Ligand binder design. Structure first.
Ligand SMILES: CC(C(=O)SCCNC(=O)CCNC(=O)[C@H](O)C(C)(C)COP(=O)(O)OP(=O)(O)OC[C@H]1O[C@@H](n2cnc3c(N)ncnc32)[C@H](O)[C@@H]1OP(=O)(O)O)=[N+]([O-])[O-]
Ligand SMILES: CC(C(=O)SCCNC(=O)CCNC(=O)[C@H](O)C(C)(C)COP(=O)(O)OP(=O)(O)OC[C@H]1O[C@@H](n2cnc3c(N)ncnc32)[C@H](O)[C@@H]1OP(=O)(O)O)=[N+]([O-])[O-]
Ligand SMILES: CC(C(=O)SCCNC(=O)CCNC(=O)[C@H](O)C(C)(C)COP(=O)(O)OP(=O)(O)OC[C@H]1O[C@@H](n2cnc3c(N)ncnc32)[C@H](O)[C@@H]1OP(=O)(O)O)=[N+]([O-])[O-]
Ligand SMILES: CC(C(=O)SCCNC(=O)CCNC(=O)[C@H](O)C(C)(C)COP(=O)(O)OP(=O)(O)OC[C@H]1O[C@@H](n2cnc3c(N)ncnc32)[C@H](O)[C@@H]1OP(=O)(O)O)=[N+]([O-])[O-]
Ligand SMILES: CC(C(=O)SCCNC(=O)CCNC(=O)[C@H](O)C(C)(C)COP(=O)(O)OP(=O)(O)OC[C@H]1O[C@@H](n2cnc3c(N)ncnc32)[C@H](O)[C@@H]1OP(=O)(O)O)=[N+]([O-])[O-]
Ligand SMILES: CC(C(=O)SCCNC(=O)CCNC(=O)[C@H](O)C(C)(C)COP(=O)(O)OP(=O)(O)OC[C@H]1O[C@@H](n2cnc3c(N)ncnc32)[C@H](O)[C@@H]1OP(=O)(O)O)=[N+]([O-])[O-]
Ligand SMILES: CC(C(=O)SCCNC(=O)CCNC(=O)[C@H](O)C(C)(C)COP(=O)(O)OP(=O)(O)OC[C@H]1O[C@@H](n2cnc3c(N)ncnc32)[C@H](O)[C@@H]1OP(=O)(O)O)=[N+]([O-])[O-]
Ligand SMILES: CC(C(=O)SCCNC(=O)CCNC(=O)[C@H](O)C(C)(C)COP(=O)(O)OP(=O)(O)OC[C@H]1O[C@@H](n2cnc3c(N)ncnc32)[C@H](O)[C@@H]1OP(=O)(O)O)=[N+]([O-])[O-]
Ligand SMILES: [K+]
Ligand code: NI
Ligand code: NI
Ligand code: NI
Lengths: 260, 260, 260, 260, 260, 260
């Protein structure tokens, strides 16, 4: 058992259900540690497919990165050991398919989390927002790259620059989702596909998944390029605007961004 | 003439029609060698556009890899000079547009083959499946990469991990196909597009096709990461599951995969 | 302040309107130089979003490359400091979002230009063509790469090899456009989004845009592959077909290409 | 304790002495497994510097690959989890400096092993050979890469194509070695340098070592190039010459190579 | 004129002489800002070659990083816009040859600075060391890469891991220096070579220098590798050892490093 | 038989001797075409090693590029299919070792040509110069890269920026040469080594040479960086200085370069 997730097994399929509704399944360190422990505990030959879900009837699938766990300024908010950075790597390297089964609204790092998973099947009422520009956070290269493998650049830029929610129907049309189903059909539609995958050759699925992962990451740059980007990110996490974005969230008010 | 293909030329357009229906146009070496010779023989200045097709009324466009040519020994059947690997390189490097004109069901290696071509125009009743997880085959990096340039990562993973067929209408919606036409209109729709292309500048088409080819290949990795993937593939070829997948297909029974 | 563009500032949004309609906003050096000056002049903290547009009611958004500036004797017109190559770099490096708000027909280099921008919102009557195979132009690697980040490879090759126009509805369906609206709604829809973006954290927007730019460019190749492609491009520029394509456009007649 | 190595710790320096004289420290699996276990056991905060050595007075440092373990069947003997391949990765990823202290003759795989280490200090009488062309072995990319970071290409090609031994004085002159010492001063000299390194900041040493490792490995190629090299290597291990080289080595006779 | 450098021009050669002897030409921001202003001022077609030198008779060429300008902990000490990072880029991108003419001892960042120049001519009495491990500084990837284009990996690792000085004779032997000459001959020898270079084709020198720069930079990696390295560097600049290294330098005592 | 070379084979070693002394073995197209034909003719299983040499007693091994064949019209003289560019690719791809056996002075493109070969054995009286800065030629990326795999960057920049000759002794010290011998020992020493190599496994030598070639080329850049370099090289071939450099050479006087 786990404090912040609940696991059920049906034949060869494991379903990991978030249990952190008190913070709307925000990706806090202690929540992600339990999610990672539950995945590791399910890395055995008789489990063939994972489903990630929020509880049935959830308004909010996940509120994204825990804003309270972001640093106050002057520190990189999305360093390699950050919980969002850990969970996306672990999903992508996990040698079984991971299906995100989505009911409710999806925010920021939770949208990156489901994008990092293998398939996304969603309720017709689910919504999707990418929100770091609401807070002034300099998103990291790996995080942004994880958003670019489904929908086109123009679509990704609209999502990130507007931070406006999109419907499940629009997320299907642009290539983000695999399927959209009525919420009463979501569980059994997802499980039917997970059990079907579970009869296929797991060692073949694992090596093809890993081949896709390394091909997806195979956009290479030189050290100077990376250090230049990192210096720009540093100017953002050093900015007055970053402090304003954090404070506006704390004070539950609209931020006033000024470009320094 | 050719034993396993038929070629027709209409001014600047050449049609290469499969003639291997006895074996559902399975990608046997003798068939691929004839397709490659026919293409090589059409690399002439007065030919400007190629169409690949199965015969009119075909239920099966191509059944994919020939099971009888798949070595149960160590030997990787997706090594550099295996016929499927040769013909996808040849299609990609060919200095004229190649249009796949699809009637019937497309499977496995034959799906990769049409994905390697420049345009796909399909009958409304055509269907598409990617099948190596049905046999436990560790599909090779180049081969997987060839499936990633049209539909997004979530869609590709659904196709590969489920091995479930999709309709022409879904293949159009996700970006695999250019056009879906009623079967009675397929040949004329495809020919008029090929004749139209054939009035454009062939040297410009050739260099822009080659620029697209090298940009599409330009996902680069270090030697250690390639050798690490090859070790994983060899472990799949050495598995009990790989033996079970091939024997099950030969014996017409459901495989029992166990994950070693 | 500018001969060939008009600028209007509405709160934090700047609308740059083409003023070269007597040449259908063809990408003449004098026009592109004024566009780049007006954009540079808008790189100030109190400007948060840019819209590029043709005048209200335009039949032609932009006619693409100016034929009279296309060099006969040798010179690559798609060299690093040619105006279209300069303006696409400037648009992609500009630290504010740039929305192309499209009314009318978009051709060739102007299609690349709007594809280089962050979002494209188009009138339901707008049309889109990529035309270099009409003239035998060997379009350059960077220019072709700029066309590959939205729609898939099969679609891009149809657009380039046919040089046929596509509707706004098809451009939306394949992932090229963000939104298609009735022409009467184009300003309201586009400005509402631009004002919304202008509420967000500009430094986070700038660094994410730059991360996407560098990831988009991170398709790397060795020097030999680049030099090989440049030799193929030079052979097209030296071709009789290239002379025929320019002469036919200048004489308002159908080119007859011969493959040398 | 270990069957095949002896470990001595002197404050922050650990000396791992080979104890496989029975087979002249040939890189047999049982010897390399003990060497890797000993290194792993020494990955502790209070150890700062490792020395690898053969016993004092040894005429042979290491005879290289155990040829009774290079399979004359079909399998690649330089696959990712071959002992030589494992030990070079472990040495390069180890977060402390590893110094090869060499007395005696160094052969083939043992030469690659010391080249993968951080520093090489050698007796004036030690000799160095790289021997795969004696046996017809298609050495792997990673393995060859590990020989290219010290001496220039022409020097490396002479070593590999001739398989001739070089002196310690020549190995110093071409940049393979750090220092050449009289044999009676070898241990004192090496330990003095190891104790000195051990006074420096270990976390800085570890991150700079890892920075050099990844820069060393950052020669990137596409999947097709790697698969093309893989197919060339398979042709070599399938050759008559490969069987002849292994047999001639086992039978202590000169091989007769014929180019197939 | 400049507070912290003296410039003389002799025909087409400019000599930039350090004037910061009271701080042993440590790389303080005020010194580097003046050196960069002097270089920019000399980017003129009548200047063909630059010499960087310390005053005649200098015991210390440069004491390297100003440790009063090292941030205290929690902050990256070698960010993109830090003075040493700016001057190495500026040296590398400068379209004229820059010759480091070395008299005296060279330390740490000053060693990286001369390595970033095009040629190094040194007095027989000059000495060179690379010192970050003395303080626990996590040297950045670009800075380490600048140290790897002359001497081999084993030699570079000895220099960095020991922080021990090498002689001009050994620096010549391992490929760091171009020439070593008696101090009395140093100015005349270096000026003769700079005048010689100044009669060659400056635009050919400039493009070949730039080709070398981008080839030297062209070791590429994926974003995850870069961010993993940055995470490791941050753990070092967050360490108690980093604070102890800085404190011990300011208190003029031997540090006690413990590995956290 | 060949007009511009003489070939002698004994056993498994072929010697290709230049026969173009009346033009100092200048790299004229007719000479390089004959060298490439003779190499192609020797790509037979019973030939195992090639030696390239000038006749015994040659003062000039090769005068490099024929200045009569360098275009003054605005054509790149180092385009992909230039004879020097062809022969360096052919030497590097050739599946046998190629030894340059040098007597006499080596200039410009001939220096690149011997650097592209696998080993260099030289007379003690031989000399080496790299001269494009004498004529104002913007040497191409591939050609510069071919000069960077033996000596370090500082040495390479001295050779190129000074265009000054270096002795065989210095060429040996800096890592360019394998061996320097007295001229009366040059044939015997080189034949001994070539016949020794010919007793080794040719398929292993061929695949290791190809692995080295691919690793050597695996310095990758994005399209924008290559196109930016191309633009710089074009500005050099459009220069007053490039005309002055070719005119001075034809008129047998010193050029006056001005930086335009
Ligand atoms: C990677 C990354 C990110 O993920 S940044 C985080 C992005 N997340 C978001 O923008 C979502 C922010 N939250 C919201 O928009 C709204 O809270 C939701 C999710 C729509 C829910 O709206 P509701 O009206 O139902 O609930 P409510 O706002 O009242 O929130 C319920 C409680 O959870 C808190 N909360 C919500 N989202 C949170 C988050 N992401 N982190 C920490 N606390 C959070 C909120 O402050 C409140 O605290 P309180 O109990 O002390 O007042 N990044 O780079 O920035
Ligand atoms: C590098 C490169 C090139 O340089 S291609 C060079 C030619 N450009 C293209 O092919 C791009 C596609 N554009 C086009 O096909 C044509 O411009 C359009 C869309 C059909 C429209 O041409 P139309 O003949 O209908 O134009 P219309 O008659 O309505 O012409 C209205 C006015 O615009 C002028 N004009 C139209 N297109 C022009 C162009 N591409 N360049 C210069 N002037 C143009 C035309 O001369 C006339 O002015 P005038 O009255 O002073 O003479 N490339 O990659 O393709
Ligand atoms: O559509 P189709 O199947 O007819 O093919 P396609 O138009 O390429 O055959 C070329 C025709 O489309 C026209 N066209 C090309 N791009 C266009 C665009 N962006 N908007 C409107 N018309 C365009 C082109 O000038 C030519 O007109 P024309 O009728 O005067 O020849
Ligand atoms: O030039 P060389 O004539 O020295 O080359 P060669 O390969 O013949 O090598 C001279 C001898 O040194 C041997 N050898 C190879 N690598 C060696 C090493 N690291 N240390 C000592 N001897 C070595 C090689 O087996 C040959 O043995 P053998 O005499 O017992 O047959
Ligand atoms: C990576 C790679 C390689 O490393 S190829 C292998 C390269 N190694 C060699 O050529 C060296 C092979 N060994 C020799 O040349 C000679 O054994 C030595 C090093 C010169 C010394 O000659 P010695 O007269 O002192 O000793 P000797 O040959 O008797 O060898 C002493 C003992 O070790 C055994 N032995 C020596 N080299 C061995 C090897 N490479 N593999 C397995 N056993 C080996 C040998 O069979 C004998 O065992 P036994 O008692 O059971 O018969 N590759 O792929 O090419
Ligand atoms: C890039 C990088 C680095 O550069 S690492 C640190 C690199 N720097 C070094 O390793 C140099 C360490 N400094 C020294 O060892 C010594 O100061 C010198 C160069 C070696 C020589 O020994 P000396 O006995 O001559 O020192 P000296 O007594 O001559 O000191 C002469 C004057 O220069 C000042 N000074 C010397 N080194 C300094 C430094 N690193 N920073 C600031 N001021 C310095 C010092 O405070 C004094 O000024 P003051 O009179 O106003 O107080 N990195 O990452 O590590
Ligand atoms: O050879 P070494 O014995 O000098 O190695 P080691 O690393 O001990 O350092 C030798 C001595 O030279 C000093 N040193 C370091 N880099 C130096 C350089 N480029 N020039 C002169 N001395 C240097 C170092 O501080 C030490 O002085 P110290 O006496 O104050 O500790
Ligand atoms: S553009 C790449 C640049 N190529 C080079 O830098 C090679 C430069 N060549 C030289 O420095 C010298 O010409 C050589 C190599 C040292 C040899 O000098 P020598 O005193 O032995 O003979 P000399 O220069 O007089 O050369 C005898 C003849 O060969 C001609 N020649 C020499 N190198 C040549 C070359 N690379 N291309 C064409 N002609 C050349 C030279 O112009 C002279 O012409 P002529 O008979 O029509 O008057
Ligand atoms: K201006
Ligand atoms: Ni990509
Ligand atoms: Ni502590
Ligand atoms: Ni390199």
């Amino acid at each position: 058992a786990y404090q912040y997730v609940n696991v059920v097994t049906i034949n060869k399929v494991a379903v990991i259900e978030f249990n952190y509704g008190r913070k709307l399944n925000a990706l806090s360190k202690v929540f992600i540690d339990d999610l990672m422990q539950a995945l590791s505990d399910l890395n055995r030959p008789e489990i063939r497919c994972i489903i990630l879900r929020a509880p049935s009837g959830s308004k909010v699938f996940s509120a994204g990165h825990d804003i309270h766990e972001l640093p106050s300024g002057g520190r990189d908010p999305l360093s390699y050991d950050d919980p969002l950075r850990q969970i996306t790597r672990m999903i992508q390297k996990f040698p079984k398919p991971i299906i995100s089964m989505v009911e409710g609204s999806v925010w920021g790092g939770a949208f990156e989390m489901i994008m990092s998973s293998d398939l996304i099947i969603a309720a017709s009422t689910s919504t999707f927002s990418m929100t770091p520009v609401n807070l002034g956070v300099p998103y990291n290269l790996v995080g942004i790259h994880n958003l670019t493998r489904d929908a086109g650049f123009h679509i990704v830029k609209e999502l990130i620059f507007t931070a406006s929610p999109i419907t499940a129907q629009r997320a299907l049309a642009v290539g983000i989702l695999n399927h959209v189903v009525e919420v009463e059909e979501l569980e059994d539609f997802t499980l039917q596909m997970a059990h079907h995958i579970s009869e296929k050759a797991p060692l073949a699925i694992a090596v093809i998944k890993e081949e896709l992962r390394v091909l997806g990451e195979a956009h290479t740059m030189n050290s100077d390029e990376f250090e230049r980007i990192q210096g720009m990110r540093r100017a953002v996490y050093d900015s007055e605007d970053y402090q304003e974005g954090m404070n506006a969230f704390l004070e539950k008010r609209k931020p006033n961004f000024v470009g320094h």
